[model samples]
Target: ITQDTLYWNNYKTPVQIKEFGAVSKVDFSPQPPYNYAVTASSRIHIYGRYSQEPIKTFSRFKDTAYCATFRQDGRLLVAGSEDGGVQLFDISGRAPLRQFEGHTKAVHTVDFTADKYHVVSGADDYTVKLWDIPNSKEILTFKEHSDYVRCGCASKLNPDLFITGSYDHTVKMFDARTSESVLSVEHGQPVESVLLFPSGGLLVSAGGRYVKVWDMLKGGQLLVSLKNHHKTVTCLCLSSSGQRLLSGSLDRKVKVYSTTSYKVVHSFDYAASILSLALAHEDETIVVGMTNGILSVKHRK
Candidate 1:
């Protein structure tokens, strides 16, 4: 392992509710001027910085928004819904921006490309689709997994590269230019979450009570396993500094682990299963989505 070390403080905020069903995804606004958006089975709830009430709520057609992320400018938010469509929202205008519909199943995950004009979404139909948000065109679709596609994480260091994890016990890397999977990661159990290292050489996947670290550039070789969690890992986020890793699990706990030595530095328990976790880039604040319709923020002590 490299000598570089990552550090982060841990905290859990007071519970805030907005909707019903499981909170599927939690992300802070990319346009720092905004705040945070939490997506659940059927609604998107927006919370301003330090605000008690949700500033806006987006819902239509009885759709369940499963996953979401903001555009780089923070002007637009993208979300995937059970209706198999990718919806964009305008945070500034507090209204709908546009929608991308193509998938045949619920869009389980969504993320913007580096340019923010394109989006990639995964679905229960076992396919990943890329869209030109400006042209509103489905440019590419790739399918292989046999089960639910849980998430697709675009590489921070490579706009053309992204990784997808599925209930098929696998994670695969695809080239944005060709829509071809260049490598496949075989996990011993179902991969619930996956992420690429900031350096672009490593891949980390967690599920079924285990976390496996892989050297992505080394032909996706398994490097290490961090085994201590007693339950399935539901969500994970790497700190902006890439020094620390945060994970929420079915064990009803949030854990902080060191990236260098893979040590658990801290852990906090909650009353319900944590569905998603996002660490603040500037501070130690973390936002967690729960099995209940609760959105929480935890600050470092």
Candidate 2:
């Protein structure tokens, strides 16, 4: 908890990027030669490492775009929009390669599974869906949540498995092989974010100033609950090796925790509340998107 051990000074001041509206999400590509995507307002911006300007911008969405995520190969980008569409774009192209439309409400989150052929999405329609990439058709849909789904993530180990967190105070897991929810856990508060470990054995859910770790192997058993933030926990991300857990909150702080000890390894403060976070897989670069349309990047040597 001391400044010397916290690595606070190692964090560099970021070159802020201004957007037309609040940055909703930030995600780094899974593969090497890494690049990142930022979703703000009705547009999606893709940028290279430490670059102040975007390499590409997808502005075809007619409404607010929620999350923009990259495929495992880094060649395709998938994003959800307030217009109820999940759009896929080729990194080298100007327009979307395809758009999947089924959700009748805002699509809040989306991600590609490990196989990279299927896409999973959670929406305001209180549904989580699995869509076939090559065919551009939905394969299955789970409708268990009684409220809006705020976030979602696909398992890295099994492409058929995925999870979603919702405002109904619950986190639900689904198997693409089945239409029913395979598992469910009460978060006791509106679940703002969710993440699955690389091994897919652990799950993290963030909400209401608390971050809860769960054991997927033990049937959604609660492992530990971290209550360090003063405000709502907005996002969660894991380090490349899956040894560190990162949580960002509306309290204007980001805390990095050691997975082995479940203790704070380091922490950083920002001027505005954090809306999204991403840790690069190949480097010690941390990107934080704020509620004030500021995108901050800190690189460690």
Candidate 3:
């Protein structure tokens, strides 16, 4: 198979990787020709042009760092570590500017509102918190989940509205202003990923072998369910057009499915579990974080 039709196990080797410390999270800067940022064992690594090594490395946490993402302006970055605190990095220096501490258990995910001034984080303590970043204070704390929250993403249409998924086998919508849950939908399995579509019209949730699509306007109604993966689907990314969906699974395969019909049109195997994945531009290629400490950049056929 060519590089586009299938991921090349040889040409897809990681450009640079740490010898130890497993990677837990991956994200891309919200810019054109999107590059990436990653959270590894205890550090954050940014990769882009003009640098084969990490653009910058922030490694000041006692435990593993779980997740990180850039603010709206891309001037600042926020990361959460296993110590139950969220740290803000200026991205202009090596050390974090400050730490936002409150979670009683390990912090698992951090997200930013459309305005970038507000932040939300989920943790092992079973809490989702909304923070006013400029004031460095917790504005809302959602204790709706009975299990550890894995990831969260805010909605641009309503800064006060965001989505959170957890190991409790459910996903919930919360209102940041009232600090109340607006909706809770059970996924019937550990929900590993939940993300709002760019249009804010739909949301996608994936875990195990199924990928469920929810239409936000229809009371979070189920749009479609994709079940082509033979193993656990670790990551799900919708194309810029939102017409195609990409899923990286534990079976060492990445499948490209049409969102319109939820039909698999492409598949690639690299003999490693893809823990994290991101689409850079259109459906051209995808960067995958593997369980074996390798990053695969697969071009589209």
Candidate 4:
């Protein structure tokens, strides 16, 4: 079954959606009825792209919920909170029209800023702020991680850039007009995911079990370190013509690489562990978030 494993076997058998905890983020929504979002525990629901129900639900999290992104004109929705705050929702609204509260811990990444008026965060309070989405205010504050910054991303082509990933194993790159960090790297682990390429010139960072690659126009240079996840690589995506690259694992696996020979061709297996991954429409939906509350979906057939 070569040919990229029968073109990834055109995914067709996965539909588990149970959530209540542990599904930690699954994004997807760039318009055209893509509809997806799934951060679990304290909630974030939102399905639809073939209706697995839940058209919207956003629980206003007081504890867990991290990275629920979308808003490249998908009409806004941003999330982060392990109770540290950074909320915004307008995907048909249900409270929180804006709420950035200066993290002190538990923000676990949040994004939006390709000129959508700023918003970026990362926390466990190792700092990384930048929010302004129409005066929700708090613009700039890169504290350069010493540990715990989970992940952060933005810059579909500059809006002053931004990129993060940490548990202090490094990976910086921020420049919302500079307060510091114009680039950095080290992802020697504990970096749990960070992606970028849409021609922003390559970048990705997953963690522990490796999934590195970075050439952000040659300043972040490292280009390739993808050790087929034996355990930690928790999330990273691209395949809406970014030419395939997807990773997810805690060893529940989800391989599928080949961004011009990054090779791993295809793989998929699940039940638990993989925490968040996405691809919609262009990849014909394949969302997957797991860890016992599994949201695993797969449509293309």
**C-alpha TM-score for every candidate:** 0.91, 0.95, 0.88, 0.35
Shift in Å, residue 124, candidate 4: 27
On TM-score, the stronger of 3 and 4 is: 3
Top-lDDT candidate index: 2
Name the candidate, 1 or 4, with the larger lDDT value. 4
| Model 3 pairs in collision | none
Model 2 C-alpha RMSD to native: 1.8
What clash pairs does model 2 have?
none
lDDT of 1 at 101: 80
Residue 235, candidate 2: Cα error in Å is 0.7
Cα lDDT of model 4 by residue, 101-128, tens digit = 8787789788888888888888897988
Model 2 spans > 4 angstroms off: 1-9, 94-96
Name the lDDT value of residue 264 in candidate 4: 89
lDDT (Cα, tens digit) per residue for candidate 2, span 1-301: 5753555456566767787678899989877668889999989888888778988887664889888998989888888888789989888785446889999999998999989999999999999889999888998988899999889999888988899999999999888777788889888999999988877778899999899999988999999999999999999987776677889999999998889878987878888999999988744678889999999888876
Q: Write the per-residue lDDT of candidate 1 for residues 1-301, one digit (tens) a residue.
A: 2332222333334656645668788888756644788787677788765666778877664767777787878778888878788888887775555878888998888888777788878999999888887787998889878888887788766778888898999988888777578888887788888888767788889888888888888898998887777889888888767777878898888777788888887777777888888765565567777887677676565
Candidate with best TM-score: 2
Q: Order the numbered candidates by TM-score, best leading.
A: 2, 1, 3, 4
Ranking by lDDT: 2, 4, 1, 3
Better of 1 and 2 by lDDT: 2
